[PDB]
Amino acid sequence: MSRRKQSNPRQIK
């Protein structure tokens, strides 16, 4: 588990 990326990226369609 890496602190450098957010745990919940969101899609823009």
Added chain:
Amino acid sequence: VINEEYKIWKKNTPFLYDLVMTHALEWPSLTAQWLPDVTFSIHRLVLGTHTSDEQNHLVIASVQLPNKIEIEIKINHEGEVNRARYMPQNPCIIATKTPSSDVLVFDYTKHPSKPDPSGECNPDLRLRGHQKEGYGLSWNPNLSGHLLSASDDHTICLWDISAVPKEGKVVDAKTIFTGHTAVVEDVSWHLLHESLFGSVADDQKLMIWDTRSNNTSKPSHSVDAHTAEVNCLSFNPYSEFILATGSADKTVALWDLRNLKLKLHSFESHKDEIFQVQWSPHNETILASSGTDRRLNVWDLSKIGEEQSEDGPPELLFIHGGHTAKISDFSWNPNEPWVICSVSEDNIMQVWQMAENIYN
């Protein structure tokens, strides 16, 4: 707070910038780098995806600049792209860091422009050596095909792929460097000396390594660099003794390889952890940094010590306040001076150029 700063940024763009373009990508990218070739002119960017699902791709985007933004190619990738970097000697070749710990190599010219709907990843090389994922990734610009990688496993791996047919094969690391005692956040070759490279880690150290040394567990120098994790470094392309590091301590430090006992300068203005620092490809006194405070700061070391009338120190040339979320990566355009591309966690990619009167 963010929302108010942003409204004030929007009102001021015509006075602070010669160019601002904003684009919301489908998924956020953790990575950004301008490819070196240019065909208004057409420039291209290597980007990646970070998704909540399994639709991951290495991405090449095109950008039209004065002399719109489009996806030119997506290539199936195993998991999110932690970082992607083109090889300076042949920029069709892109290395990528995967969450599995593999480093993958693609020749993007070998792939269909629409990715395989099956979702299979078909890398030209699979580079083995790490036990954990990571971020740092660096091609040696003086020795073709020598690639460094830094990982959360506390190690740096080096591969030499120059004699390997790019036909899907697995290659083990030629050398593994073990001097750090915590996550290695970044690694970078020196830009003029083919044997030298730096690394920075959560142990608060900058290490300088020489590939000519028989000892892979102890670097040539080990520098107590910051009062917290050191996340990024960058060697100056025009000044052979100078490099910079950026840190969770909110500062960028300036170093001289001739005497690393003493930091040369500390650039102070960021309000949160710094993740990226890069020297200008055009101007030896100019560097930039970005990170968690959503700001990208541009610094000019020729101004250290100058009398001012402050809003910040005199070496702070410009604060880019266009992003409203953490900045994951940014890249100076190597063909159009002062153009930067920056990408943030909220899917936004910005391509911008501060007003000429600011640096002039």
